[PDB]
Amino acid sequence: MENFQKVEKIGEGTYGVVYKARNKLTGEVVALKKIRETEGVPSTAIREISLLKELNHPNIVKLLDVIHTENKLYLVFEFLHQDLKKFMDASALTGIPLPLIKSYLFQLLQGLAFCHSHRVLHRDLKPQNLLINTEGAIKLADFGLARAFGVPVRTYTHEVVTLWYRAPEILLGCKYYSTAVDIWSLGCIFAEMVTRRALFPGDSEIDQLFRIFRTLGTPDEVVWPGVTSMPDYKPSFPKWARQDFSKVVPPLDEDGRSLLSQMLHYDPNKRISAKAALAHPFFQDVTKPVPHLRL
Numbered sequence: 001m002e003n004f005q006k007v008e009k010i011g012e013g014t015y016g017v018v019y020k021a022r023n024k025l026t027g028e029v030v031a032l033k034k035i036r037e038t039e040g041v042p043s044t045a046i047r048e049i050s051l052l053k054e055l056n057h058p059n060i061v062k063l064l065d066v067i068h069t070e071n072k073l074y075l076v077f078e079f080l081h082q083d084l085k086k087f088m089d090a091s092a093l094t095g096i097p098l099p100l101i102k103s104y105l106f107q108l109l110q111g112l113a114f115c116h117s118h119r120v121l122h123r124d125l126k127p128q129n130l131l132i133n134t135e136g137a138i139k140l141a142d143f144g145l146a147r148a149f150g151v152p153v154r155t156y157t158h159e160v161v162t163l164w165y166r167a168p169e170i171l172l173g174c175k176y177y178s179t180a181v182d183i184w185s186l187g188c189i190f191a192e193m194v195t196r197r198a199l200f201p202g203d204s205e206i207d208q209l210f211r212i213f214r215t216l217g218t219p220d221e222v223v224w225p226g227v228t229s230m231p232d233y234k235p236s237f238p239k240w241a242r243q244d245f246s247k248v249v250p251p252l253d254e255d256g257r258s259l260l261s262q263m264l265h266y267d268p269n270k271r272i273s274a275k276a277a278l279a280h281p282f283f284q285d286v287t288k289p290v291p292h293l294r295l
C-alpha cells in the first residue's frame with residue numbers, strides 16, 4: 001500500500017503473508033499481514049477480528065488496525081524482534097537454557113489464559129507465531145483467525161501447512177474445538193524447545209496422528225471416552241502401547257515432564273487449563289532471563 005515503505009517479507013502463515021513495513025508519515029515499524037474464495041471479504045469476520053483490537057496483554061502481540069480494502073484484508077501488528085522458530089534454529093547447537101525455556105512457557109500460558117478467559121482461541125499455535133524481544137518477553141500472534149474466518153487448507157495459493165502442533169481431536173475431525181487445542185500445541189512447542197526436535201513431525205494428517213499414537217499410545221474409551229465415535233476414528237487404527245515418558249523429553253526434570261504430560265492428555269476435558277498450568281510446581285522457581293538474539 002501507498003502508506004508504507006514496506007521493508008521486507010517476514011514470512012508466510014496459514015492465513016496469509018506477513019511483511020515488515022514502515023509507515024512513511026509516522027515512521028513506526030509494524031508487522032503487516034495480508035489475508036488472501038476471494039469473493040470480496042466477509043463482513044462477519046471483519047467485526048470479529050476488529051474486536052481483537054481490544055486485546056491488551058503483555059503476552060499477546062498487539063493488533064493495531066484491521067483494514068479492509070479491495071479484496072484484501074490487512075492486519076497491522078506491533079513489530080517484535082524475532083520469531084521463536086528462528087530463535088530455536090539459532091539455538092540448535094547449544095539449546096535454549098532451561099530457565100529461559102521455563103520463562104517463555106510461563107509467559108505463553110499467561111497469554112493463553114488471558115485469551116481463553118476472553119473466549120478467544122488460537123487454534124493455529126506454532127513456533128512461527130510466537131514472537132520474542134530482546135528483553136525476555138514472548139508474545140502470541142494471530143489469535144481468533146480460524147474462528148472468524150473458518151479454517152481453509154492453505155493461505156491462498158499452494159502452501160504446506162504445519163500439522164505438527166495439531167491437537168488429536170482436530171485430526172480425528174471433531175467439529176467443535178475447545179481451548180484445550182491451544183494447550184496441546186503449547187505442549188508440543190515446550191517439548192521442542194527442550195529436545196531441539198519437533199515432538200510429532202507428521203508428514204500427513206494420518207502420519208501426524210500415528211506419530212502421536214506411537215508415542216502416547218493409541219487412545220481408547222478408557223483414556224478418552226467418546227474417542228471411538230469421532231468422525232475420522234477407524235477401528236482399524238493400529239494399537240500401539242504408550243511409550244515410557246522419560247524417553248519423550250529426557251533433559252526435562254520430573255516437574256516439567258508431569259506438566260507436559262497434563263498438557264498432552266488425549267481427552268480435551270482432562271487436558272490441563274492454562275490457568276491451572278500456571279500453578280504447576282514446575283514454575284515455582286520461574287525467572288525472566290534475557291535471550292541472546294542475533295538481529
Ligand SMILES: O=C(O)c1ccc(Nc2nccc(Nc3ccccc3Cl)n2)cc1
Binds near residue numbers: 129141
Ligand atoms: O524472521 C525474522 O527475522 C522476523 C520474524 C518476525 C519479526 N517480527 C514480527 N512482529 C510481529 C508479528 C510478526 N509476524 C506475524 C504478524 C501477523 C500475524 C502473525 C505473525 Cl507470526 N513478526 C521480526 C523478524
